[PDB]
Design a protein around this ligand. Structure first.
Ligand SMILES: CS(=O)(=O)N1CCC[C@@H](NC(=O)[C@H](CCC2CCCCC2)NC(=O)c2ccc(CNC(=O)c3cnn(-c4ccccc4)c3N)cc2)C1
Length: 331
């Protein structure tokens, strides 16, 4: 029982969407790609419709499209973006070439929310950790967490997403030198610090400067962590730099809530085996007033075996088409 579509141009781009979506207006200045705001006549709420660009232009684009659809269909959590609809005007695989995604209309990102109160930071970071506990439990690593990938509405309700299109300021040092899930926790540490102080914690100009700033705070690796670098070039570099002491975070986040400081000490550790996880962090005393261990769920298992597959462009397209058809809309 297929719906009725209607076509229209919008800023040198064609849009064929269910009549159920109306009053489409472009949002961003193309920053988010081809995205419009909309009114959903089924529900009566604003939505965001994104039309992918050249989704099957190449083998790599076909796989990235399939990956994005598969991940979005899996996410069912209050602090993670979710898929409200996915559709295509095509009536059969032979004419399938465009893919539309429908999500909630997000309010503003965390860059667009002056420092916050300590209570505001607790709530926002709490919600990020809660969604991270959920994606991490599915063996899903975000990898690109940063204020522009956090959406927050007027109730300060937060959702994690990934718009795609600097990342380096938030990036774990191990995956910037190539020597697990807690790369995301490092980024939370950087975000949390910024909310507290009002300043980018590690505003590095490139990768070597980014590492220089990081070690000035957390200190040069010790032999405990040195014993775990396999990359021989990485070891030589770190041992050649000037030995800089670990700073005491209380002298750097002066005046901040000492629970917040203690949590920063547990997130912004160089050794990834010692970094706090999302689930452990939810139990930190700093979130004492939001922590609810009975309402911090994990995710269903996520089959990502496809990621190790080499398929042709038309096969990835077919699989994307499967996921479009099999899609069941939520409540
Ligand atoms: C690293 S890559 O391999 O994966 N891959 C490359 C990089 C991007 C990756 N994104 C993903 O896979 C995620 C889902 C998977 C991701 C996994 C980790 C946990 C978060 C979700 N795609 C998205 O997040 C996404 C998809 C569609 C949409 C559509 N709504 C909008 O655009 C929208 C809604 N509101 N607004 C807005 C906000 C404020 C003001 C005005 C407008 C918009 N502009 C938005 C986001 C894919």
């Amino acid at each position: 029982e297929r719906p009725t579509f209607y076509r229209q141009e919008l800023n040198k781009t064609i849009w064929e969407v269910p009549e159920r979506y109306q009053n489409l207006s472009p949002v961003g200045s193309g920053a988010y790609g081809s995205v419009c705001a909309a009114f959903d006549t089924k529900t009566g709420h604003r939505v965001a419709v994104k039309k992918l660009s050249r989704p099957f232009q190449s083998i790599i684009h076909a796989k990235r499209t399939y990956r994005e659809l598969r991940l979005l269909k899996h996410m069912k959590h209050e602090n993670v973006i979710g898929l409200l609809d996915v559709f295509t005007p095509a009536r059969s695989l032979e004419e399938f070439n465009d893919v539309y995604l429908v999500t909630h209309l997000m309010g503003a990102d965390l860059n667009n929310i002056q420092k916050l109160t300590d209570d505001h930071v607790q709530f926002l970071i709490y919600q990020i950790l809660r969604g991270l506990k959920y994606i991490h439990s599915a063996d899903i690593i975000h990898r690109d967490l940063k204020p522009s990938n956090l959406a927050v509405n007027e109730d300060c309700e937060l959702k994690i997403l990934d718009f795609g299109l600097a990342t380096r300021w938030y990036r774990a040092p191990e995956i910037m030198l190539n020597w697990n899930q807690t790369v995301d926790i490092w980024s939370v540490g950087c975000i949390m610090a910024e909310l507290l102080t009002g300043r980018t914690l590690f505003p590095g100009t490139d990768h070597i400067d980014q590492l220089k700033l990081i070690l000035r705070l957390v200190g040069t690796p010790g032999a405990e962590l040195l014993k775990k670098i396999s990359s021989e070039s990485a070891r030589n570099y770190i041992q050649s730099l000037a030995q800089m002491p670990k700073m005491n975070f209380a002298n750097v986040f002066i005046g901040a809530n000492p629970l917040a400081v203690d949590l920063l000490e547990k997130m912004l550790v160089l050794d990834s085996d010692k970094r706090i996880t999302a689930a452990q962090a939810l139990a930190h005393a700093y979130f004492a007033q939001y922590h609810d261990p009975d309402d911090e769920p994990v995710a269903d298992p996520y089959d990502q075996s496809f990621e190790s597959r080499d398929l042709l462009i038309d096969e990835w397209k077919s699989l994307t088409y499967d996921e479009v058809i099999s899609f069941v809309p939520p409540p």
